[PDB]
RNA sequence: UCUUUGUCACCCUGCU
RNA sequence: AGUAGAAACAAGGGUGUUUUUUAU
């Protein structure tokens, strides 16, 4: 029964909304500005960083004059004279937490917060790039397809594997191995056992992510590498190279920022009385009645930033180009075409001329086509840069492959088709 | 019983 | 595992530096 899970989603949303209207009562943020997105985004960032046992270690060490480690904050954004200002403020950890508990009947409800971190992470990946990290690893950048959701902490929602990507697993494993061959003490001790268990756990997560026989066999052979070595890296490399085709739909939860919260409850939709279906028509049934705004820099066409943030929230970073095209009815791409800059604002950047905009947040729109498309010969030439498996690997790899673009998963339907 | 970490590079030693 | 045999090896010791800002 979904409905008890829905009772869960309801209790967490109402706890969080209690805290939200409390915070506002401490914020008196205007209703108009109640939709300028960057404000509530950094507002989110606040409570995100607010939770860190490691930061607790930070304060314990007191290595630097970190801003009252027991208290945290960042730049906030109010206006004057129709123009806007920057304000560095900071709340106190225990105080926010105490709100949080009497916002959560004394509990925490980490669920919605982790959801918000999913939000921030998908935003980053959709809006930014980290090829320089691959430079730190040394493999093809265009491998990027499987970096969906890269920026998530090692202690964040572990079931987030729903979004944690293959390439993430690859690169983190390579890290562990690299650092592993950097020390013998790395394995001696209970630290060794616990890290080994977690390592194998990551391997098992990868198994779950794999769905084909030869892949299972190669990944298993990998798992047997009980000692950190070097060849395993290249095995994983070519396995990923073959899997570039061999992709299955991942969990893509159309997580939208919470800034809606005020207007969300003003619209009357508690996650309780109706639960929710985050995948399906429910997301598109809530991305039209809402309303959200954003601070604007001139001489950057506000329409570019519009499309960028819209699809960023849409989390379609690796969706079919032409699918997204018929999805919004006006051409889209990776950012290279998305001629704009970041949605937020940097410190030294001079806000002294910025502007405001009631931004557009809509689109055009069963499974008419399979969107199937083979690859290009460069894809197979990728292999020539290099067990029994490679025979089978090569075999299917040369005839014909079923899907060109990375992924095309969404419960989308027609807007006027709210039932289907 | 499903709980690595806020990130990596350089020296030296050869019986004292 | 193996060398070896009344106790050992299967290497041993030091040096670095993180809160933001983003696309080739």
Residue numbers in the entry: 21 to 385, 411 to 431, 438 to 471
From the paper:
Influenza virus ribonucleoprotein complexes (RNPs), composed of the polymerase complex (FluPol), nucleoprotein (NP), and RNA, are essential for replication and transcription. In the life cycle of the influenza virus, the viral genome RNA (vRNA) or the positive-sense complementary RNA (cRNA) segments are encapsidated by a virus-encoded nucleoprotein (NP), with their 5′ and 3′ termini clamped by the polymerase complex (FluPol; composed of PA, PB1, and PB2), thus forming the ribonucleoprotein complexes (RNPs). We report atomic-resolution cryo-EM structures of mini-vRNPs in two states: FluPol located inside (State-In) or at the outer rim (State-Out) of the NP–RNA ring. In State-In, interfaces for FluPol dimerization or Pol II interaction are blocked, but fully exposed in State-Out. These structures reveal detailed FluPol–NP–RNA coupling and suggest a conformational shift in RNPs during the viral life cycle.
In the FluPol:NP-0:RNA unit, the nucleotides at the 5′ and 3′ ends of vRNA form a distal double-stranded section of the vRNA promoter, which extrudes out from FluPol and points to NP-0. The loop spanning residues D72 to K90 in NP-0, which includes an ɑ-helix region (D72-E81), inserts into the fork of the double-stranded part of the paired vRNA, thus separating them into single strands. The single-stranded RNA in both 5′ and 3′ directions is further bound into a deep positively charged groove clamped by the head and the body domain of NP-0, forming an RNA-binding groove to protect the RNA. The interacting residues of 5′ RNA in NP-0 include L61, R65, G86, K87, N144, T147, Y148, Q149, T151, R152, R208, R355, G356, R361, G362, Q364, A366 and S367. The residues of NP-0 that contact with the 3′ RNA include R74, Y78, H82, R156, T157, R174, R195, R195, M196, R199, F206 and K214. The structures of NP-0 and NP+2, which have the best densities for the NPs in two representative positions, make structural movements in the D72-K90 and Q405-G460 regions. It is worth noting that the loop spanning residues D72-K90 (D72-K90 loop) of NP-0 folds into an ɑ-helix upon binding to the fork of the double-stranded region of the vRNA, which is consistent with observation in other RNA-NP complex structures. The interaction of NP and vRNA has two distinct forms, either in FluPol:NP-0:RNA unit, or in NP+1:NP+2:RNA unit representing the vRNA in complex with NPs in the regular positions. Compared to NPs in the regular position (e.g., NP+2), two regions of the polypeptide of NP-0 (D72-K90 and I201-N211) exhibit a clear conformational shift upon binding with RNA and FluPol, in particular the D72-K90 loop that folded into an ɑ-helix. Additional, the distal 5′ and 3′ vRNA duplex are stabilized and separated by NP-0, which is not consistent with the previous vRNP model that proposed the 5′ and 3′ distal ends would attach one NP molecular, respectively.
